[PDB]
Amino acid sequence: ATRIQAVYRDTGVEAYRDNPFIEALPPLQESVNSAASLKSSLQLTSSDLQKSRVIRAHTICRIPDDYFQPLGTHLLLSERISVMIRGGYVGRNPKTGDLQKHLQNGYERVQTGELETFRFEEARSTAQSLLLIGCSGSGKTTSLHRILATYPQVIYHRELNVEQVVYLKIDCSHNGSLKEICLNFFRALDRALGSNYERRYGLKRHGIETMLALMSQIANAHALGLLVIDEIQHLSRSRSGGSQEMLNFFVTMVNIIGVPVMLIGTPKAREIFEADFGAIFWDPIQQTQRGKPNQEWIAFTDNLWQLQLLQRKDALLSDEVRDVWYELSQGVMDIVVKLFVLAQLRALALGNERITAGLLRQVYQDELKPVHPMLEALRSGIPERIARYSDLVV
Amino acid sequence: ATRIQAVYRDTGVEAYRDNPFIEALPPLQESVNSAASLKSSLQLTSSDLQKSRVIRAHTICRIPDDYFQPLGTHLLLSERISVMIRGGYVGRNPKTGDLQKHLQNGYERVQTGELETFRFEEARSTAQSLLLIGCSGSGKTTSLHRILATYPQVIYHRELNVEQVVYLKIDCSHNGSLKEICLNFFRALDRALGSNYERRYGLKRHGIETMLALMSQIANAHALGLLVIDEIQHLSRSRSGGSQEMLNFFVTMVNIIGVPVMLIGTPKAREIFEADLRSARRGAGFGAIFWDPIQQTQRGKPNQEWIAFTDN
Amino acid sequence: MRNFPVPYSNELIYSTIARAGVYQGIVSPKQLLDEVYGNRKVVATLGLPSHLGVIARHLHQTGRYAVQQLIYEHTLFPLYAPFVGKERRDEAIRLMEYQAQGAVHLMLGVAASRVKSDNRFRYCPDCVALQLNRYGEAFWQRDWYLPALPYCPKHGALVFFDRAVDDHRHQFWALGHTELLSDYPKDSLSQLTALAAYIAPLLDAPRAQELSPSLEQWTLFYQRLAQDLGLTKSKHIRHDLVAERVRQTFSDEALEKLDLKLAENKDTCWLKSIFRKHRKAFSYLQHSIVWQALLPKLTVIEALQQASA
Amino acid sequence: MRNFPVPYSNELIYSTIARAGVYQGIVSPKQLLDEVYGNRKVVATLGLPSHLGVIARHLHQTGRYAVQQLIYEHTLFPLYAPFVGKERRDEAIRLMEYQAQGAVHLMLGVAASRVKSDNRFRYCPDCVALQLNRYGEAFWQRDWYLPALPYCPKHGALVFFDRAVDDHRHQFWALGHTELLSDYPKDSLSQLTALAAYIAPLLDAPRAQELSPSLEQWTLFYQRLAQDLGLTKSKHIRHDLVAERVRQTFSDEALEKLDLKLAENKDTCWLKSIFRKHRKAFSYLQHSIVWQALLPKLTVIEALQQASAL
DNA sequence: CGTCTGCCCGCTATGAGCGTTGCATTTATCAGGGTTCTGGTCCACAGTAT
């Protein structure tokens, strides 16, 4: 709970002229500066190379946690999410008296139980929706965390008495239950506020038709900027005739209530959407763009290579090493870093301090057994083989 | 075990600089020297030769309970266990008190225009996992009650009030039910701290999701360091649900709970995790270890390990 | 509660608590009582509330609203304190903050003042339009809920919902029936509106926090008023000139609505008693009618200052 | 239970049990099931009910109504009784006296067609006037709920309304005339009405109780009939003259409606299986069509007697 | 006309009936297996063409 007092800025947009919620948000960065903000890497030191073997081997294992190198798509995602967060507060101005009319419309939705009723026709929603699909290991969670780490979440206003919540993240239940998605929301809300809402709402005997309204009203008492739901493919493994009503409620909320909604899912989750939103697609990177090597792959590999703690290290990367690195990993982001770390740890353990092709082959063959069939299918390139299995590239 | 009062010792790695939980642990050791610390043997070899036959039989019956001899495959496992235990504590640093002022100063400076970019906080994503596979009778539990026996279990911190449960061990059941895995956690935590978690949480009628969201709240009050799940073979479609929910439960568990998880099983239990790239990505998150029996020879000449195991 | 709505301009605490219940969607009144107050046995009081410590605790993070501001800005207290006495006023201010409901009513005699409190809810058609245009909300107002005179000072009279606050002792109710509008153009007399306009600025008076004469001061000031009006005789009263002046200023039918009628035949009337020895506290109306009848050159605050002089 | 109604003339026991809770003000179906039966595991079935015997216990003092009368007079059993044979009829009769519901359907293998069809509540609007002017009550009648004919043997078509028996498993429903009146004329076929009129007197015939042939009697009867009829090949069928007679007697639309469309091209036909050696029991429709096309002047009971005696 | 004698009177404690609540029980949902059932299939035989 990063509870920080608010100071009001001076934006240049005419639509954001007097809104406290938009003015209290940190200023938006340019295209150049936003990429520089996201970049992070392990610091390393000149004296760290010459230390004990254990002291080094406990430092190589920190590479995956403290390394980030943004590609082109991350800037586009950051811009889209910033626009979605900032542009949804124009219909919920508290100074003019537009937020206080949404809260009156939402009381009778609790009383009646039907989420299409209204009392003031002047109340309007100005929210949008987003959908994200990509193969496993692409980085759909860590990139979102890095993007949203810029905003301060809980902000306290003094002239008013509200505590604006800029964003919130939950995940779908494994069971596909309808009563657990409405409880994860309350748990994640009172974890980031310190309050106790699960005892108020979850504990009482409530049907889904009224939990789906209490959830939406308590999402408006605190001005909630954005809601992101992770692992959306779990909705398929639900009771018959149960997957559709949440899909209808997530689009009722954006259209009527006004709370923006973002969804993240595996390519297995398209069969419950296309058969029954704005979609942005993510794919593994490739060496060959049109007929020449893709500069981003070389950039990523070269930036990763400077993190070695080996005493006898090669100065520059050879072409064959990069070719083997791409052949074994097949472009997925998560396998690359783990293969690097495991190969380096074996290099320390054996005694030889230089990474070679044979060392990479031995580590890949011995230590990564369970991931063999999927990478082999992706390496075959046959559409029938890639279409097999699940949670792979579309 | 038992509430050992903490005594802090400095660690040579920069990232482990100021964490009470990491510093209260036993000091770092070399991999070669640590594997030799597990050796044990019987001290009665010559002094007890002349005695009655029943006493000698009673002495002989205790050979497979007190004779342990390390091999070349224990040092890798010991290193992995040490790194997994110590590396999961960096994001759980309790000693911080200047966060509010620093964050507010950064906010003011980025609002006025002096500073361009800032980073407030970031949540943690996923915990390290490991897999150990080998045939039965190969020694996957005798060799792991001794790697974890060089650590204290419960440690009491004087300045704070947390009781750092260093590790915890549970076993799967023959039924393979998903509700008896969330019910052995509370029992094993009760058999160590002498608390009353099973009555408060387990006995009430709660869903598997609600009871899994309570296992990540009492694993945070006590800074639990490692969780070991043994006999993972018994989930091979034994009972209690379909394969897809049986595979979703583990993924949600790894995503939710903050502690590292280790899994031990039989060569028939890799068919569970060899089904989709998510399961194989999380099972082999920190490498996969496959164990094989001793061979007489590797290249022409006989193995020295066989000679040393059948001579001592 | 997490966040408690700030009170609007000239609004009772009853409306604020009702809005606090509305904003977070708490339908069962018992749950609202659990969330705002500690216990389930606190009554819903409209005008002169108790338990005013927890509300100020809820609004603590803001630097504006304290207990003293809540006593005089969002309560009917300012028209009770100057006419009861300094010691009793100080005891009321000290005691109403803590857990005491019947004690303050018994000590100020508000329950004894009116055997039938105007428990029926009120509604001003024209004021609600300005509230909707300005704030986007509808809330109860202090000008509507005068203890005995149901006239809005700015315009006309007040319609009645006919629902009583005493029907449910544990429910806080909010004005939200789609602003139910009806025409009730009937009026008794514009003198009632003039009296309401005269007494209205007493509610918002910074100098009303400290001015509180004593019984001896009250009787000597009334004797001085009888002297300087000149309508007094040796060891007696005129008994007719003051009645003639009141009749000129106030119509008898108008006085019928205020439940106060002059009885010249019998000697229990308040008009003689207000010039005789003071032994019991008098309401604001009984002073205000005399003020409007005999001394119209001064407003209520100036008259109070002169009396305390 | 103290006052269990006696069944009306030509009524299914489903209607009787349904009225046994309208006469006493029991609304919730679970209470009615707990009173009449003592269990909440019973399933409401129109035609071929089970759990009988507890119904005969309630009507004990009225000496006439026993299990045999209820089985043979107020159910659809006589439609299936003669054609199955002597071997399974006794077993089905024994099974219907106890708590085996699906076993009765399995034993009557012609009715063991897995999932059924057309479970909507039928009625005939013309007969209800007689029911109201004679008894003061309206009830389900065995004429309406023939296994495959949605026709009344005396008036014509049946007016369906879209409520299914399997929609609510444990609820017994009784017809109400205020809800009932939804009569609208429909298309009518005279040939199927004549077939229904021909097949109706089988229900109220005492001969079907104790007379049932066997498979080899059936094939001997068919082969003797074919040989005496003269339109046969050498110990085989002409496959054309019999089919032509069937088409002359009944139109193609009628057989399409009855779900027994003739298929000359394919080798597997119901008529061909009838001619060949019998391996399983057949429905009443096929036997009735064969009898009507091949014996155009003889009644059902006498035809069955001729088939069974020799 | 005021304190004592009657009078008022707000208040307080108690019990029988009615309306509300939490726990245990019943009911429903879903996956897996299986075991006979029956539905179409191929083989050998009788009668007809060279």
Ligand SMILES: Nc1ncnc2c1ncn2[C@@H]1O[C@H](COP(=O)(O)OP(=O)(O)OP(O)(O)=S)[C@@H](O)[C@H]1O
């Ligand atoms: N640009 C990047 N730079 C460095 N590491 C990256 C980058 N993108 C991804 N990673 C690594 O890849 C992993 C991120 O993937 P995850 O956080 O597991 O989410 P994911 O890729 O969506 O897989 P899911 O959620 O199971 S479908 C981490 O190990 C990161 O270190």
Ligand SMILES: Nc1ncnc2c1ncn2[C@@H]1O[C@H](COP(=O)(O)OP(=O)(O)O)[C@@H](O)[C@H]1O
């Ligand atoms: N390094 C070793 N030296 C001596 N005995 C061993 C060693 N490793 C395992 N054993 C023996 O193996 C036996 C069985 O091991 P066990 O715990 O059953 O392994 P698992 O559960 O994998 O079968 C133990 O009694 C132990 O004596």
Ligand SMILES: [Mg+2]
């Ligand atoms: Mg993810």
Ligand SMILES: [Mg+2]
């Ligand atoms: Mg074992």
Ligand SMILES: [Zn+2]
């Ligand atoms: Zn007004």
Ligand SMILES: [Zn+2]
């Ligand atoms: Zn009819």
